[PDB]
Amino acid sequence: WTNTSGSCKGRCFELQEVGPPDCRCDNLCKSYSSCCHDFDELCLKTARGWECTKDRCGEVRNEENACHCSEDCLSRGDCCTNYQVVCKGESHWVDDDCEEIRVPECPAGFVRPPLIIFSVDGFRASYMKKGSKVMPNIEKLRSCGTHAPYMRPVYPTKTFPNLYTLATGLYPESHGIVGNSMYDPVFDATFHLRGREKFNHRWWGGQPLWITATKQGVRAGTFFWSVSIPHERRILTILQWLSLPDNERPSVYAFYSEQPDFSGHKYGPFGPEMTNPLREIDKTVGQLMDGLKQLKLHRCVNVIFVGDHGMEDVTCDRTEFLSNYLTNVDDITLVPGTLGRIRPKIPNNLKYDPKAIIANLTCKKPDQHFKPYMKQHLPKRLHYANNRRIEDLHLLVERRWHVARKPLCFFQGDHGFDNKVNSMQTVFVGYGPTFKYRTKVPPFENIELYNVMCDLLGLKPAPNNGTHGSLNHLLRTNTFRPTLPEEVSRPNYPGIMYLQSDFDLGCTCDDKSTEERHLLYGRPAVLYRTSYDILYHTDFESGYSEIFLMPLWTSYTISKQAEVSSIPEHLTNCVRPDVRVSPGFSQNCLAYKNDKQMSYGFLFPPYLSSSPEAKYDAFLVTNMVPMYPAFKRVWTYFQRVLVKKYASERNGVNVISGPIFDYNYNGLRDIEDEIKQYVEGSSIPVPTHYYSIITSCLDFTQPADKCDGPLSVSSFILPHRPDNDESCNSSEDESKWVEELMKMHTARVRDIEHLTGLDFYRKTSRSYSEILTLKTYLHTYE
Ligand SMILES: *[C@@H]1O[C@H](CO)[C@@H](O[C@@H]2O[C@H](CO)[C@@H](O[C@@H]3O[C@H](CO[C@H]4O[C@H](CO)[C@@H](O)[C@H](O[C@H]5O[C@H](CO)[C@@H](O)[C@H](O)[C@@H]5O[C@H]5O[C@H](CO)[C@@H](O)[C@H](O)[C@@H]5O)[C@@H]4O)[C@@H](O)[C@H](O)[C@@H]3O)[C@H](O)[C@H]2NC(C)=O)[C@H](O)[C@H]1NC(C)=O
Ligand SMILES: *[C@@H]1O[C@H](CO)[C@@H](O[C@@H]2O[C@H](CO)[C@@H](O)[C@H](O)[C@H]2NC(C)=O)[C@H](O)[C@H]1NC(C)=O
Ligand SMILES: *[C@@H]1O[C@H](CO)[C@@H](O[C@@H]2O[C@H](CO)[C@@H](O)[C@H](O)[C@H]2NC(C)=O)[C@H](O)[C@H]1NC(C)=O
Ligand SMILES: CCCCCCCCCCCCCC(=O)OC[C@@H](O)COP(=O)(O)O
Ligand SMILES: [Ca+2]
Ligand SMILES: [K+]
Ligand code: NA
Ligand SMILES: [Zn+2]
Ligand SMILES: [Zn+2]
Numbered sequence: 001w002t003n004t005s006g007s008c009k010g011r012c013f014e015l016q017e018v019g020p021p022d023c024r025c026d027n028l029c030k031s032y033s034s035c036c037h038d039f040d041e042l043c044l045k046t047a048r049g050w051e052c053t054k055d056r057c058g059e060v061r062n063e064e065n066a067c068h069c070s071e072d073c074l075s076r077g078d079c080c081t082n083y084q085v086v087c088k089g090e091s092h093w094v095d096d097d098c099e100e101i102r103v104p105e106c107p108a109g110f111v112r113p114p115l116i117i118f119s120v121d122g123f124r125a126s127y128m129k130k131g132s133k134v135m136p137n138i139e140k141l142r143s144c145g146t147h148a149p150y151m152r153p154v155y156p157t158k159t160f161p162n163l164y165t166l167a168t169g170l171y172p173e174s175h176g177i178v179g180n181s182m183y184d185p186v187f188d189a190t191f192h193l194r195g196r197e198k199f200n201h202r203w204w205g206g207q208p209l210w211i212t213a214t215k216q217g218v219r220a221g222t223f224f225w226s227v228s229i230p231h232e233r234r235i236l237t238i239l240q241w242l243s244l245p246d247n248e249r250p251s252v253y254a255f256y257s258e259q260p261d262f263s264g265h266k267y268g269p270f271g272p273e274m275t276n277p278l279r280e281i282d283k284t285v286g287q288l289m290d291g292l293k294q295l296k297l298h299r300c301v302n303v304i305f306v307g308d309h310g311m312e313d314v315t316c317d318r319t320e321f322l323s324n325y326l327t328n329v330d331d332i333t334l335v336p337g338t339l340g341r342i343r344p345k346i347p348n349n350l351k352y353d354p355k356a357i358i359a360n361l362t363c364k365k366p367d368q369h370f371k372p373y374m375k376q377h378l379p380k381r382l383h384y385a386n387n388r389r390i391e392d393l394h395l396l397v398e399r400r401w402h403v404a405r406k407p408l409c410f411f412q413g414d415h416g417f418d419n420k421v422n423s424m425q426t427v428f429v430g431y432g433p434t435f436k437y438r439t440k441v442p443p444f445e446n447i448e449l450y451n452v453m454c455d456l457l458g459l460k461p462a463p464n465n466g467t468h469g470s471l472n473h474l475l476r477t478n479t480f481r482p483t484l485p486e487e488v489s490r491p492n493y494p495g496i497m498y499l500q501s502d503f504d505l506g507c508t509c510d511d512k513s514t515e516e517r518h519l520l521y522g523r524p525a526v527l528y529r530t531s532y533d534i535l536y537h538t539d540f541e542s543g544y545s546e547i548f549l550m551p552l553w554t555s556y557t558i559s560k561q562a563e564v565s566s567i568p569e570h571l572t573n574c575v576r577p578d579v580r581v582s583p584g585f586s587q588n589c590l591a592y593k594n595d596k597q598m599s600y601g602f603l604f605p606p607y608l609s610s611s612p613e614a615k616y617d618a619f620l621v622t623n624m625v626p627m628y629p630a631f632k633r634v635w636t637y638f639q640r641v642l643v644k645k646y647a648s649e650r651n652g653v654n655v656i657s658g659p660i661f662d663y664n665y666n667g668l669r670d671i672e673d674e675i676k677q678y679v680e681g682s683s684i685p686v687p688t689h690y691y692s693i694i695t696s697c698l699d700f701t702q703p704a705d706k707c708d709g710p711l712s713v714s715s716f717i718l719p720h721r722p723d724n725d726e727s728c729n730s731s732e733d734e735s736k737w738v739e740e741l742m743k744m745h746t747a748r749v750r751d752i753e754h755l756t757g758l759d760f761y762r763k764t765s766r767s768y769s770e771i772l773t774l775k776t777y778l779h780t781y782e
Contacts, residue, residue, distance in 0.1 A: 002034040011036070012043035013237050015219070015250065027222045027229065027237070031199070050232040050287070052080040057087035067236055074294070077243025078236065081291040093289035093298055094137045098144035102476075104433040106300035109246040113433050114301045115456050116238065117254045118288070119166070120281055121159060122261025122415065123307035124269050125150035125425040127278060134275055135282040137289055138429075141305055144438060145431030146474050152445045152778070153309040153426055155382045155419040156339045159261070160193060162308040162446065167208035167223065169450025169464030171383040171667075173390065176205040181335060182389045185347060207462035209453055213252055216459050221253040231257060231284050239291040242301075252457055255288070257281055264311035268412035269423065302434050302456055306449070307426030312399055314338065314414035320369050320397075323406035325360050332357075334405045338416030340370065340395030354393055361395070363728040369401040376665040377726070379745050380689065380717045380755070381778065382419065383465075385665040399423060420746075420780045436476050444471060444776065455480055467750055470772040482768050485759050487525035491534045491543060494580045503577035506590030507621060511570045514541055518556050520654045520705060521695070522763025526552065528669065535580060535622060538614040540604040544622050546585040547672070549684050553658040553758060554603035554623070557705055558647040564640065567606050571619065575600075578622040586621050587684050595680030597722065601627040603657045605639030625659055626679050626686050628722045634741060635690065635718075637734040642742075643694075650696040650712065652704040659687035660717060660755045669757040689717045691752045693760065710766065714779035717747040717755065749775040 001021060008025035018024050020034070025043060029035035047065045048056075056069035066080075069087055073079035084090040104113045128147075132139035154165045154172055160180045161172040172178045180193040184203075191198050210220040221241055225234055238253050263277040285305070292298040323329045331349070335341040344352040354374075361372040373394045375385040384390060397403050399421050402414065417424055425443070434456055451468045454461040455478045461468065469482030514536040515523075524543065526532065532545045532552060540556035575589050592600050602623045609615030617623070627635060647653045661670035663677070677686040693715040697707030718741070724730035729737040749760055753775070761771045 002032075004035065004037045006036045008036040008039050008042045013222075013240070015221070015241070015248065027226060028224050030226045030228060031224075044229065044233065046230075050080060050236075052083045052086040054086060066232075077240050077295075079294060081235065081239070081287040081294065084294050085290065090293070092286060093293045094140055094286055096293075098140060098438075099299075100437040101299045101433045104300050107296050110300060112251065112458060113456070114242065114250070114297075115252045115453060116288070116301055116303050117166075117252070117453070118257075118285065118303060118305045119163065119254065120257045120305070120307050120427070121259065122264045122309065122311050123281075123427045124260075124264070124310035124423065125307075125427055126269075126310075126422075127260065127274070128427060130275075130278060134278050135285075137282050137285040138305065141285070141303065141431045142429045145303075145429050146435040146437075146439045146441060147429045148441050148443050150425035150443045151306065151428040152443060153307075153419050153424060154446060155384055156416045157309040157419050157421075157424040158338075158416045159308050163256075164204070164206075164208065166306065166308070166446055166449055167210070168206035169447055169461060169466045170206045171447065171465050173383055173385060173387040173667075174206060174465065176203055176387065176389065178384075178387050178389045179335060179339075179341070183333075183343065183347075184389050186388060188347065206464070209252065209450060212454065212459055212462055213457060218252065218457055218459060219248075219250040221250040223254045225256055227258075231255075232287065235284060235287045235291065238288070239295065242292075242295060242297060252453075255284075257284065261311070264413040264415075265411050266413070268313045268315075269311040270313065271412065299433065302430065302432030304449075304453070305427065305429040305431070306446075307428075309415050310422075310424045310426050311413045311415050312338075312417065312421070312423035313412065314400055314402055315412050316409035318369070318400055319402045319404050321404050321406050322361075325364055326357060329405045332405070334403070335391070336404050337402050338397050338414050340372075340393075340397060340403045341391040342393040342395070343391045357393065362725055368728070369398040370395045370403050371726070373726075376688075377719055377721070379747075380662075380667065380751055381745070381747050383667055386667060420778070420782060422782045430474055434475055434478050436474065439474075441471075441474055442773075442777075445778075448776065451480070467772050467776050469769045470776045472769040473773065479769070482772060484762065484768065485525065485527055487759075488528055489526040489530050489532065491523070491526075491532055494533045494535075496579050498577075498579045498582065500577060500579065502579075503583045503586070505575075505577055505583065505586060505588035505621065506593060507575040507577060507588065509571070509574040509576045509619060511568075511574070514538065517705065518654075520557065520707075521711075521761045523555075524553055524656070524758040524760050525762055526757060527759055528757040533581060535578070537604070537617045539608065539610050539617065540623075542603070542623070544581060546581070548659070548661075549585065549587050550625050551603055551622070551658055552756065553656050555654070555656045556604055556608075557652065557654045558608055558643055559652045559705070560647055560650075560703065562608060562644060562647055562652075564607055564644050565609055565612070565615065567615075568612075571606070571615075574616075574619040575621055575624060576616070576619050578620045581622055587624060587679075588621075588682070591679040591682035591684055592626075597628065598626050598679055598686070599629050599632060600624050601632055601635050602639075605643065607640045608643065625690070626684055627690075628720065630722055630724045631690075631718075631720050633724065633730070633734055634738050637738045638692070638742070641735075642739070646694055646696075650704070651700050651702070652696060654695045654704050655692060656695075656760070657690065657692040658756065658758075660689040660691055660752070661685060662688050662755055667751070667754055669755055687720050689720055689755070691715065691717045691747070691755070693749055693752060708765070710770070711761075711764070711774055713749060713774055713777055715747050715749055715752060716742055716745050717751060718742065718745050743781040746779050746781060748778050 011025040023036040052069040267273040451466040472479040542551040606618035698710040
């Protein structure tokens, strides 16, 4: 029980924690119905609006007014933000020429630059092109500070998952806020954007910035604002807090606007009606900047202007209904819209038939505007599976569409789609002494920002999914010096030790400076305990695992001119034992011969052999991996057609390929115990995915093997599945569907590192920070 009889006199937006029975006056009291009886009266004044006018200048102080224009207002820290312009002949900040801020220019008593996070909801990256004609304050921040052309949100691209990802550096599957709405089967409770359940702390995992700050003795302003508090009051509050005594002043502040999201939903992102909302946000940024200038802080504070996601054209006319595919939709609950998550209406309903549901949802219309996935089958780049609140059955919805349960307008915009979709991209600008001046940086992911905000505040980040150092290039100072991870397992280098006669594997082969060329960036470091051999070959090198009975990685270079050679008919089934590696640490062809479902393939493709001679190396048992025929359709097309196409287009390519084991879909290398499938009658483990990392010279005029500067990389993590049900056109020639599949399963090198325990690019001519940026790159194909 809270005693509302108390008073917020001299307590408005106090920062001290106050629990029952005492009543509160903080920004969040209204949400807890714990405000004192005079909160709204004392703390939420509106009298005379938010702007000084000439007739108010040097007024006598009336405490009833929203903000003040009296002579004392400055030292009391509560002038209207435009007070000096109107009353003292100063200029608005926006009208001042930009000037490099080489070091913080902070008043007496400031030990470090404060950080202000200005978050805007549904701010599509492309809105920035509207420029100073619509958003002059924001355009000044953008042009004079550090900006990216866009920032990638996390999936699903909705507000709660993204704001909490911004605060924690975590994927939703890790922080727990996996949607704006979710059901937790253990709590047997439901979380909604609106309603009180979300206030319960059990939902929120990881360690958000305000807690990290507090635990390290850095004070934080509020990172929540009650919907009922006007933006102007939020801004005045921040400025008032910045005017507090040195021993009370917070170091980090957050402002949030629910625009332009609201207007985007109503009108769509290209509506002329979007101009007004964007002007209003800009006016708010100007209030803040004018306010800071009034306080002599405008060259002291670091400002981050950042969105949570974008906005797409989505109308009533573009809605798929499950009732068109399924007989009884009244027995399922659907989290609907720009994504789908399906569970039985009655929790744990035993008659729930997921395999039958998925079958009825797979490739049933030619123009079908969604695709069902069991969550372990979603592209690994989404990192959307390892949480009990994520339903097994997911629908990935096509951009511009909605999915609804049944048929049983006022909206022209929505968001939530796949986070590589252009319309979902959002904004990032950093401005202030710690950011660079007039600098553009490539797009990056929002999971990276937590580390950077920690850097900006002198904090040590809690464990998270950013790659610390990958954004060092945004900063003038306060960069993080990353350290190379230490290798855990050194390789063996086996020479010949056996005779062809030593081998009884069931394999038949009818007819009978490698590094320099093939490990352009050094051998990958193995970061776990295991046993593996380096193997050299004319055309490729590999780290062959004696535990998993196949390479952890296979590395090879293909020059622009390389010749694609066929596999001779007599070599079709050719598999040759490898006299460097024990029969006991080898696969055997008998397992394949007998497994009626599983075939095999090669990591180094015989099609790219450097001579009919060398091609015999490609058929070694130590180059072979278990592949379903369905997967082989993809992999052969890749090996035979695509690698050469890339070599041709990029002036040669360096390729590293290998298996991934992630049976528990946690995005991390499986230990032996977690692997759940083996080739029939054997102990050959079956990968859940195969990866390829394709590197070349950023300057395409230089060949990959003779690159002097920055690198270019694209990579994939392809699902190893027994059918091609994912690809609706797979009945056609591979040229009609394989690349489309591959694009959906594009990945970062960093993703592959998590999934393999390998560390790549350890020997290059670039800085470690640059390499970290390279490893976080995602080739989107948009
Ligand atoms: C993205 O970055 C994160 C953070 O580093 C990585 O997530 C970590 O993975 C490691 C290795 O698997 C886990 O280690 C285990 O920790 C548990 C004990 O963990 C408890 O205590 C820690 C520390 O206080 C706490 O962070 C954990 O929080 C988890 O569980 C909470 C209660 O259910 C929950 O509220 C919170 O959201 C979080 O859930 C997530 O993780 C759990 C697994 O712990 C997972 O089941 C769930 O679905 C969510 O994904 C927890 O209270 C030990 O007992 C084990 O032995 C082992 O040490 C970390 O727990 C985990 N950290 C977090 C915060 O998720 C990701 O791997 C990384 N992803 C990628 C792809 O790189
Ligand atoms: C709820 O808060 C009110 C206001 O603080 C408390 O009222 C005070 O109670 C004391 C006696 O306990 C009186 O001497 C004061 O005059 C009261 N203040 C006013 C202005 O009313 C009240 O006690 C609280 N209720 C509780 C403690 O249950
Ligand atoms: C999957 O779709 C098929 C239709 O293609 C559904 O088949 C119907 O099944 C009902 C009872 O199950 C029969 O009365 C109808 O004759 C079938 N319809 C047609 C047009 O053939 C099937 O029910 C669907 N399954 C699920 C789980 O929704
Ligand atoms: C690094 C700090 C990051 C976080 C700053 C957080 C500020 C939070 C203020 C409280 C939450 C406001 C949430 C909100 O107002 O949602 C509005 C909804 O219509 C959004 O729905 P949707 O995703 O657009 O469909
Ligand atoms: Ca795993
Ligand atoms: K077979
Ligand atoms: Na198919
Ligand atoms: Zn939002
Ligand atoms: Zn929205």
